[model samples]
Target chain A: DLKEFARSQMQAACQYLKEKNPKYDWVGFYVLEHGKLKLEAFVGEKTDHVEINLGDGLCSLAVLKNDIVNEYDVKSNPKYLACFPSTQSEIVVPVRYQGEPIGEIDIDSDKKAAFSKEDEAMLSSIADLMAPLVHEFFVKL
Target chain B: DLKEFARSQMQAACQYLKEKNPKYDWVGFYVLEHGKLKLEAFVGEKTDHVEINLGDGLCSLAVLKNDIVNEYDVKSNPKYLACFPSTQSEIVVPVRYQGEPIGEIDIDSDKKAAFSKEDEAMLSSIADLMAPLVHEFFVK
Candidate 1:
């Protein structure tokens, strides 16, 4: 049920991004599983690094910040992890389901500074939608 | 909780489509809210037609049909809603969670007959994954 819920929601969100902006090269979700970020749901080029540490890449940095992290140039960011060579910028939002970090919504852009403050605000709101459900997932588990 | 799960899964599905094909010009999900198809999640080019009635366009037709609807040449289809004139074809997969349709996945392509049977199968499986959650949303 959790996977199903995640799948549909992700589908809608992906559509929103594609329809709203042209700069978004990819969009996906990474779930925090066993202290590692697992590629649970995604929409983009496949990568070999399916699993990553919590503080390892741009995704991990979001968990580290416990907030939304936007990088204008992923290649220049020392904390960045190269998932795709074409990725120039990235945004990672931690999904705080029920007040704790459950997972994250990650976006890759082929252009630098593709994400705006408006994007952060809008995505944060979207992330809020999943927080309670993620908490419920832990409860069910 | 239901909303968050829905968002995460939807995002993953977006990544899958974007990565799988370059011609999938746009991919998104629209939920039937208050009798109108409301934009939920999306990836690709922005469109002015964000909202639509249940029978107004091809996307709505998929919702009405409660099945996968494909258009090879949107220009030739009189009922097609032009989100972007560049969009030559389109596909929509209704998401029936727990036996009831809640929303659907809408995909636009720059080429005619851009979608295949495999596309339908993959998208349907994704829709099935969203079914239970959408059902829960309606139940509450």
Candidate 2:
């Protein structure tokens, strides 16, 4: 039931982020599972991009690079997997557990250059808080 | 896999309804399982009341009566299960599969008398479309 518990926390966090920050139009999590980033919980429009192969989209790119990927203009990136046409910017922060990149927190906004240093700092803190709980999801599996 | 698929559809429907109608403040589904209503997927604030026993709340009442339960003012009802303070009205439409009530579509609004006949008709149609898919969630 840790997976379910992790999922509920992620879902609640998604809602909290979206409600707290208007620029965060969409907030979600993608957890590493079987060497792929599987969509966990999100708040926004339903997306078809549920499973992202390693090195495929910006989501996986974050885990691959082990750094935060902030695309001020998603249209400029060739690897951007389009989720919604209205999405103008995207930020992907690698979620690490035990010094290993295990997943990511992906946020999208409708306005270009929406994410600033403040956004990154806040989200990074959230990802840190989520690290241990999210790790539990993989442990039982 | 079927359960996952059903959850995705319900989640999508929640977003669709919320985006399409401004009055639809919150939309979610509660499926009957193990003698209780379990929250499936929703697009709104996180709720603690995830499971409700039989004959409890408007959600279970719709299943008990086998019809739609529309409370124009949730505060007027004594059995109303409050999810948020801003919720003024609530509507619960039973989702049936093969003539058996399997789940219910629950919607809440911030305005009193928010649900009209048209809202009921539209949600009823959505419930009909979701019935068979939701039933797959209960089946093995």
Candidate 3:
């Protein structure tokens, strides 16, 4: 039930962002599991890249640095692991609980340079709000 | 992990329905939990009624009868549990696994008579597809 509760929180957050931002084509959360990023709650087209290596995408970059990785042009970033062909931009915010990474908030946009510092700020705040739930999920795992 | 995977499937289904139908204002799934329906994955405005009793809504009617309930006008249904004030019509489809009730696919619309037999057919098929996942989710 804790996992479901955590997933619901993440789902609500994804739905909120997707509804608020027209440019956000995809919004989801990837929880760290068995040292890999496992796709979880999301509101968008289903993705084939469910299991992501830590060395692999913009999501990996965010986790490795424990910070937000905002790629204005995903095509230019070699680390970008394409989930959808139309994804032009991406933002990955590493979700940390008490200074330790638990998961991430990943968003994709069809428009190039769709993310801004304001997006980082808002998403980071949401990540912070979701940290406790994410931590609970990790503890249960 | 199985729970998370099941949630993702439900989320994807919700997203698909929301995207394909302009009249589907809200799309979500509710799992039967401890004799109540608990809202799990959803798209659209967040709802206040996360849990519902068996005697309460159209969802309950669907579950009790193991059938789909489509209300052309939500306001006219006495059993309608209002999640959003703008919801004009609604549909609730019971998901069954091996003829055993598991969960439900619930959708709301802003326009009256937004749901038709076609919507029921589409959603019931989706519910059939999701039944195994729903059962896996319920096994928890």
- Candidate 2 residue-wise lDDT, A1-141, digit = tens: 335545655686687678778988898899888888888899999888888877887897899989999999998999898888899999999888768988899999999999999888867766765675566544213
- Per-model TM-score on C-alpha atoms: 0.50, 0.50, 0.51
Q: Is the docking of candidate 1 incorrect, acceptable, medium or high quality?
A: incorrect
> What's the distance in Å from true for residue A42, model 1?
15
> For each candidate, what is the lDDT?
0.75, 0.81, 0.82
Where model 2 places Cα greater than 4 Å from the true spot, the runs are A139-141, B1-140
Which ranges in model 3 have alpha carbons more than 4 Å from their true place? A1-141
Per-residue C-alpha lDDT of model 2 across residues B1-140, encoded as one tens digit per residue: 43554565578668768877888888889888877888888988886688887877888889989999899999989878888789889999998876889889999899999998988887786777566556755531
- In model 1 chain A, where is the ten-residue run with the lowest total lDDT? A132-141
Docking class for model 3 is: incorrect
- Best-fitting candidate, scored by DockQ: 1
For residue A59, what is the lDDT in candidate 2? 93
Supply the TM-score for candidate 1. 0.50
Candidate numbers, best DockQ first, in rank order: 1, 3, 2
Model 3: DockQ score: 0.03
lDDT of 2: 0.81
- Please give, for residues B54-137, the per-residue lDDT of candidate 1 as tens digits: 788888888787878888889888889989878898999998854667888899999988999988887787666555444433
